[PDB]
C-alpha cells in the first residue's frame, strides 16, 4: 500500500471520520461522545465543496498538528492533534498526498457540532491549548536507544495515539503526562494500565502474548472489547509485524505506574472451585421471566454458563474465554466487566467476527437489570476474578449513562 495509506491506517484516521459500517469512509458524521456533548467529525474526502479539497499543504498541516481549520477557527480536541502535533513533515505530506489522491471525494456536508455554553464558542480552545502545553516540535530519533524503540515510541505516541485513552486527563480534560499510560476512564469503558508495572500494568505479560493481543485482540488471558476492539480491528491488525514488535519494545520500556490496592497481576487470579446448586433451582421451576432468581450463581448459570463453562474456564479451543485468569474479571476496577456484560463483545479480525451478545436493557437475548448485572458481576469477581472488587447496581447504572460526569461538565448546567 501507499506510504500515506499506511500512515492513515496507523493513525486510525478513517475510523472516527467514517460513520460506522455505512457512511462512505472519510465523509465524517461520526458522533464522538465528549463529556460536554457530541462532536461530529468533519468531511475529509478531497471534495472541493464539502470536504477539504481546497486545503493546501500548509493548511492541512495546521489542521493536523495544531487544531486550526482553513478559516482559522479552532478544532475541538476530539481531534488527537496533540498526539499528531509531533508528526514529521514527510509523514504529514504523505498523508496529504494520500487524502488528495487515493480517496475519492464525497460531496455531502456532515452534521454541525453544537456544544452547550460555555463550550459553544470554539475560540476559548486557544486558552485550552496554551494550558495543555501540546507543542510540539517534530519527532526526532533518540540515538541513545535503538531504532526499534524509536519507531515504537513514534507509533504509540504520534501515530496510534494510545495515550489518548490510556493516559488519564486532568481537570481541564488535558493529558496528565505525570501518569503516562496509567489507565483512564473513557466513557463507559476504561483503558487499563499498560505501563511496565508487573502487578498493575502489563509488565508480567509475555512478549508473545502482547504481540498477539495487539495483532488480533485474542489471548488466553485477555480479549479486546470496546474501543480497544475497534482500534485493533481498524488499525492495529493491518500494521506490519515489525510495527507491532516495535510497539512491544517501546511498551516494555515505559516507566511503571502503580495502582492503589494491587497485589497480583490482573491475569493471575485463580478460580475458586465453587459453583451453583442444581437442586435449589427446582423451586424456581414454573417461574417464567426470572425475577425470583436473585442468586448470583444461579444467574451466572442461566445467563452465562452456556459459553463460559460452569467453572468459568471457558471453552477448550479458546473461542469462549476463560473468566479465570482474565485481565477483565481480574481488574480491581470492575468497569470493564460491567461494560462487557452491558454491551457484549464484537471484533472482526481477518474477516472473522467474535460476537458476545449484550445483556443490557436493549438486549435481544436476555435483557438484565442493574441489580441482576451487579449480582452476576459480583459472582464472577468472587469466584473467577478479583475477590477484592465489588459491583453495585448504582455502578452499573453509572456505566450505562456513559461513566461518571467530569467536574468540568458542571459548567454546562
Amino acid at each position: 500500500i501507499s506510504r500515506g495509506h499506511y500512515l492513515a491506517i496507523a493513525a486510525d484516521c478513517a475510523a472516527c471520520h467514517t460513520n460506522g459500517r455505512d457512511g462512505q469512509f472519510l465523509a465524517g458524521g461520526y458522533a464522538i461522545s465528549s463529556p460536554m456533548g457530541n462532536i461530529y467529525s468533519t468531511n475529509i474526502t478531497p471534495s472541493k465543496t464539502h470536504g477539504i479539497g481546497n486545503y493546501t499543504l500548509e493548511q492541512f498541516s495546521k489542521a493536523l498538528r495544531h487544531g486550526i481549520r482553513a478559516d482559522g477557527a479552532q478544532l475541538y480536541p476530539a481531534m488527537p492533534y496533540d498526539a499528531y502535533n509531533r508528526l514529521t513533515d514527510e509523514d504529514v505530506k504523505s498523508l496529504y498526498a494520500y487524502i488528495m489522491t487515493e480517496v475519492k471525494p464525497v460531496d455531502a456536508p456532515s452534521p454541525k457540532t453544537q456544544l452547550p455554553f460555555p463550550f459553544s464558542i470554539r475560540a476559548s480552545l486557544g486558552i485550552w491549548k496554551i494550558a495543555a502545553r501540546i507543542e510540539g516540535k517534530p519527532y526526532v530519533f533518540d540515538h541513545t536507544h535503538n531504532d526499534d524503540w524509536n519507531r515504537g515510541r513514534y507509533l504509540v505516541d504520534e501515530l496510534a495515539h494510545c495515550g489518548e485513552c490510556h493516559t488519564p486527563r486532568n481537570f481541564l480534560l488535558a493529558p496528565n503526562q505525570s501518569a503516562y499510560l496509567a489507565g483512564a476512564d473513557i466513557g463507559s469503558w476504561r483503558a487499563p494500565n499498560i505501563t511496565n508495572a508487573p502487578q498493575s500494568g502489563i509488565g508480567s505479560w509475555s512478549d508473545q502474548d502482547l504481540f498477539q493481543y495487539l495483532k488480533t485482540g485474542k489471548t488466553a488471558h485477555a480479549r479486546a472489547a470496546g474501543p480497544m476492539a475497534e482500534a485493533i480491528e481498524h488499525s492495529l491488525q493491518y500494521l506490519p509485524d515489525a510495527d507491532i514488535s516495535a510497539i512491544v519494545t517501546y511498551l516494555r520500556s515505559v516507566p511503571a505506574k502503580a495502582e492503589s490496592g494491587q497485589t497480583v497481576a490482573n491475569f493471575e487470579h485463580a478460580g475458586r472451585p465453587s459453583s451453583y446448586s442444581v437442586a435449589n433451582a427446582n423451586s424456581r421451576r414454573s417461574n417464567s421471566t426470572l425475577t425470583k432468581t436473585t442468586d448470583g450463581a444461579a444467574l451466572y448459570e442461566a445467563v452465562c454458563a452456556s459459553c463460559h463453562q460452569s467453572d468459568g474456564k471457558g471453552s477448550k479451543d479458546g473461542y469462549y474465554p476463560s473468566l479465570v485468569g482474565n485481565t477483565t474479571t481480574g481488574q480491581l476496577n470492575p468497569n470493564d466487566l460491567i461494560a462487557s456484560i452491558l454491551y457484549g463483545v464484537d471484533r472482526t479480525t481477518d474477516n472473522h467476527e467474535i460476537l458476545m451478545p449484550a445483556f443490557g436493557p436493549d438486549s435481544l437475548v436476555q435483557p438484565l437489570t442493574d441489580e441482576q448485572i451487579a449480582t452476576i458481576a459480583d459472582y464472577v469477581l468472587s469466584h473467577f476474578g478479583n475477590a477484592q472488587a465489588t459491583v453495585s447496581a448504582d455502578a452499573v447504572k453509572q456505566v450505562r449513562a456513559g461513566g461518571k460526569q467530569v467536574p468540568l461538565a458542571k459548567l454546562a448546567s
Binding site: 442444581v278 433451582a281 427446582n282 424456581r284 421451576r285 414454573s286 417461574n287 417464567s288 421471566t289 426470572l290 432468581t293 444461579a298 444467574l299 448459570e301 442461566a302 445467563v303 452456556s306 459459553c307 473461542y319 469462549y320 457484549g344 464484537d346 467476527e353 467474535i354 460476537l355 458476545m356 451478545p357 449484550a358 436493549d362 435481544l364 437475548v365 436476555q366 435483557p367
Partner: protein, 540 residues
C-alpha cells in the same frame, strides 16, 4: 384504560404478530400489540429445561420449560392438560404444541425456515387436488426474502440440491458444516437413492443481528441458551423499542361490528377477568391456526351469529398439518447425533413430482438431537451396573438414530375447530376442539413412506426398530381461515383481509390454502409482511 386507542391493534405477539407490528411501527403507524400469555425470559426457560427430568428430555417434552398460565393455557402432553381436545381417526396427529406469551410458539422451534415450491401455490391447478393459493409464488418471493433477511436464515447458497424454490437473492448466511451424523446419513441415503440436502435454518453460521454464532448447543427445541437462532420475541422487542405498546396477559374475547360489518372495538380479559376495551382503525388477529379460528368463533355477534368472518361457514374448517411417522433404531455403525442444530438436513427428493395427483408428497429427515439422555435412561432401565452400564450408555449414545417422514394433508372441510361444549378455562372460554382425519392421500403416501423408512433402517443395519403405528403432529398449524378469491368459498382475500370485514386482517398460518411439504412458518412470516404492506396502503 377503556380507550387503548391505536392506529393498528394486533392480537397475538408471536412471530407473525411481532413481525407485523415491527414493520408497521417502522412506517409511522402507532401499534398496540396484545398477547394472552405472559412475558418470558430465555434464561429462565433454559434453567427450567435444565431442571426438567431426564425422561422428559429423552422423550421430546417441548412445553414443560414454559409454565402454562391458567388464563391463557397452552398445550402440554407430558401428562396431558386436556387444553386442546382432539377427536377423529387421526386425533394423535393433531396433539401439537403451542406456547402463549410475548414471542409465541416460536420460543421453541427448530427454526427450519423454508420456501414453498411454486407448484405448492397452485396445487389444484397443477395436480387436481387441494386448493390454490390466492397469490402465486412470485408475489410472495419479495416477502420471502424480506422475512429471511429479518430473521437471518442460513442456506445452501451455491448448490443444485434438487428441483426446489427458485431464488432471486442468495441466503443472508451460508449453511454451517454438517456434523458427523448428518454426513453419515447423507452418504447412506445417497447410496440408497435419496438426496439429503441442508435445511434452511434461521440460525447463525456467523454473528448476525447482534447475536452470537451458533455453537451447536443442540437445544433448538425447546430453548436456545445463547440466542444464536431466531425467536419472534426479537421482533417484539424491536417493535416495542420503536414505540409499539405491548400488553401481556390480554386474552381477547369479544369484537364489536358496526352497520357495515366493520370492527369498531375489541374486548380483552385479564388474569382477574376484568374486561378492557380497545378501539383502533385496523384490527389484526395473529394468534395461531388454532387460536385465531377459536377467537373468531367465540366472538360471534348478532350480525355474525356463526362467528366473525364466518359467512362461508369455513372458519375453523380445512385444518391442515404435516402428518409424520416417527421411527427409532440402533444403527450398526456409530452415528454420533448431536453435532450442530437439532435438524440440519433433510431428504427433499420427494417434495415434488407428478405422483402428487394420487398421494401426498413427503419429506424424510433425520433427527440430530443428542441421544445421551435416551441412552442413559435406556441403559438404566436394563439394570446394568459398573463398566457394562457405561459401555451401554456410550454405545446407545453413538448408535441411536431417529428418523421421521412427514406428509402433506389436503384441506378437508370436516377437519374442524369447533368450540368444546364440555371444557372451559379459568376465564370461562371454551377449550379448542379439533376433529382430524388424514385421508387416503396421506394414507397411501404413508404406506410408501413406511417402506422408505424401513429401507433406511435396513441400509443402516438398524436394531430395535420402533416405528410409531399412528401419525404424529408437526406443530405448524395451517388452515382454519382459508384464503381465496370467492367470498362464498374463502375467509380472507389475496391480501389476508377478511371478506366480511374490510377493517380486519388475519396475519396467521390459518390462511394458507395448502400445507405444503416442509415447515410453514416462513410462509406465515412472508404473508404477515404482505398484510403489513396492505395495512400500510389502507392507512396512508
Amino acid at each position: 384504560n377503556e380507550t387503548l386507542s391505536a392506529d393498528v391493534v394486533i392480537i397475538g405477539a408471536g412471530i407473525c404478530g411481532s413481525l407485523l407490528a415491527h414493520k408497521l411501527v417502522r412506517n409511522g403507524l402507532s401499534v398496540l400489540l396484545l398477547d394472552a400469555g405472559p412475558r418470558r425470559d430465555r434464561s429462565q426457560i433454559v434453567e427450567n429445561w435444565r431442571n426438567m427430568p431426564p425422561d422428559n428430555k429423552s422423550q421430546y417434552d417441548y412445553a414443560t420449560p414454559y409454565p402454562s398460565v391458567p388464563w391463557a393455557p397452552h398445550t402440554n402432553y407430558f401428562p396431558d392438560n386436556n387444553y386442546l381436545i382432539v377427536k377423529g381417526p387421526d386425533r394423535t396427529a393433531y396433539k401439537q404444541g403451542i406456547i402463549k406469551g410475548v414471542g409465541g410458539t416460536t420460543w421453541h422451534w427448530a427454526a427450519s425456515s423454508w420456501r414453498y415450491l411454486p407448484n405448492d401455490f397452485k396445487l389444484h391447478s397443477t395436480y387436481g387436488v387441494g386448493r390454490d393459493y390466492a397469490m402465486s409464488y412470485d408475489e410472495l418471493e419479495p416477502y420471502y426474502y424480506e422475512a429471511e433477511c429479518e430473521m437471518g436464515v442460513m442456506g445452501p447458497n451455491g448448490e443444485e440440491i434438487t428441483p426446489s424454490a427458485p431464488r432471486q437473492n442468495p441466503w443472508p448466511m451460508t449453511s454451517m458444516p454438517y456434523g458427523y451424523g448428518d454426513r453419515t446419513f447423507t452418504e447412506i441415503v445417497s447410496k440408497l437413492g435419496f438426496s439429503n440436502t441442508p435445511v434452511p435454518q434461521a440460525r447463525n453460521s456467523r454473528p448476525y443481528d447482534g447475536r452470537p454464532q451458533c455453537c451447536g448447543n443442540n437445544n433448538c427445541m425447546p430453548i436456545c441458551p445463547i440466542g444464536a437462532m431466531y425467536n419472534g420475541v426479537y421482533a417484539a422487542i424491536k417493535a416495542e423499542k420503536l414505540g409499539a405498546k405491548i400488553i401481556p396477559n390480554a386474552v381477547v374475547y369479544a369484537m364489536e361490528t358496526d352497520a357495515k360489518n366493520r370492527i369498531t372495538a375489541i374486548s380483552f380479559y385479564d388474569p382477574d377477568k376484568q374486561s378492557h376495551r380497545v378501539v383502533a382503525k385496523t384490527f389484526v388477529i395473529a394468534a395461531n391456526g388454532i387460536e385465531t379460528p377459536k377467537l373468531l368463533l367465540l366472538a360471534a355477534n348478532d350480525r355474525n351469529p356463526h362467528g366473525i368472518a364466518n359467512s362461508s361457514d369455513l372458519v375453523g374448517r380445512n385444518m391442515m398439518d404435516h402428518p409424520g411417522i416417527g421411527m427409532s433404531f440402533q444403527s450398526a455403525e456409530p452415528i454420533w447425533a448431536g453435532g450442530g442444530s437439532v435438524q440440519m438436513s433433510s431428504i427433499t427428493n420427494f417434495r415434488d413430482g407428478d405422483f402428487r395427483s394420487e398421494y401426498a408428497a413427503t419429506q424424510i429427515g433425520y433427527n440430530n438431537t443428542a441421544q445421551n439422555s435416551r441412552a442413559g435412561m435406556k441403559a438404566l432401565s436394563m439394570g446394568l451396573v459398573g463398566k457394562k452400564l457405561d459401555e451401554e450408555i456410550r454405545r446407545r449414545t453413538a448408535h441411536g438414530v431417529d428418523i421421521y417422514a412427514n406428509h402433506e394433508v389436503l384441506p378437508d372441510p370436516n377437519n374442524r375447530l369447533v368450540l368444546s361444549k364440555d371444557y372451559k378455562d379459568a376465564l370461562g372460554i371454551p377449550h379448542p376442539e379439533v376433529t382430524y382425519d388424514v385421508g387416503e392421500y396421506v394414507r397411501k403416501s404413508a404406506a410408501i413412506s413406511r417402506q422408505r423408512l424401513m429401507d433406511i433402517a435396513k441400509a443402516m443395519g438398524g436394531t430395535e426398530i420402533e416405528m410409531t403405528p399412528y401419525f404424529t403432529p408437526n406443530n405448524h398449524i395451517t388452515g382454519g381461515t382459508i384464503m381465496g378469491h370467492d367470498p362464498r368459498d374463502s375467509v380472507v382475500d389475496k391480501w389476508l383481509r377478511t371478506h366480511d370485514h374490510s377493517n380486519l386482517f388475519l396475519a396467521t398460518g390459518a390462511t394458507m390454502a395448502a400445507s405444503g411439504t416442509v415447515n410453514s412458518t416462513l410462509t406465515m412470516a412472508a404473508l404477515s409482511l404482505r398484510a403489513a404492506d396492505a395495512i400500510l396502503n389502507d392507512l396512508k
